[PDB]
């Protein structure tokens, strides 16, 4: 189990607005999981971990467009961990 925080530079290059570089965080990694076809329930019996961000921070900004500046919102990770995929 290894779920790590990874920094991401992201370029916004939309026609009309000023380019803008945004530095955020995402979670990436490998967690354990197993699954078998339960025919008694006729469904998949799943017991799975997934690399997810437990806590995050919103990241707002102004995109300087020629026809009206916009306000953008992005989540950025603060703690990455192997947790339930469905929660």
């Amino acid at each position: 189990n290894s779920c790590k925080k990874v920094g991401v530079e992201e370029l916004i290059n939309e026609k009309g607005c000023d380019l803008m570089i945004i530095r955020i965080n995402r979670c990436r990694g490998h967690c354990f999981s197993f699954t078998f076809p339960n025919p008694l329930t006729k469904k998949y019996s799943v017991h799975a971990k997934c690399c997810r961000m437990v806590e995050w921070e919103m990241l707002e900004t102004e995109l300087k467009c020629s026809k009206g500046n916009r306000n953008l919102r992005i989540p950025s990770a603060t703690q990455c961990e192997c947790f339930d995929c469905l929660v």
Partner: protein, 101 residues
């Protein structure tokens, strides 16, 4: 990345099936069992939904179906409870389909 094995599950060690008239057939049933560490990720994104999940679990690659017979049967049991239909394959892959249902 993933791993395949035929295993015995609590409910199927052994499996019991009861018909009308109360006649029961029991018997162990091996199940295809996929397990491993899939590469997963969660990232913040613009707009809605604000989050993106590359979530994946080790799932069986279904290539056929197996009809397993329960041996230990009560006298005069119906045939419908003497068999079980199980999806069967040979390899496991990282897939998100089990999470959907």
């Amino acid at each position: 990345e993933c791993e395949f094995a035929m295993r015995l599950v609590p409910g199927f060690n052994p499996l019991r099936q009861v018909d009308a008239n109360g006649k029961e057939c029991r018997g162990n049933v091996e199940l295809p069992f996929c397990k491993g560490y899939c590469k997963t990720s969660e990232s913040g994104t613009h707009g809605f939904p604000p989050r993106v999940q590359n979530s994946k679990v080790c799932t069986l690659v279904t290539t056929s179906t197996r009809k397993v017979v329960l041996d230990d049967c009560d006298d005069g049991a119906d045939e419908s409870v003497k068999f079980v239909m199980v999806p069967h394959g040979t390899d496991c892959e990282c897939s998100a389909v089990p999470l959907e249902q």
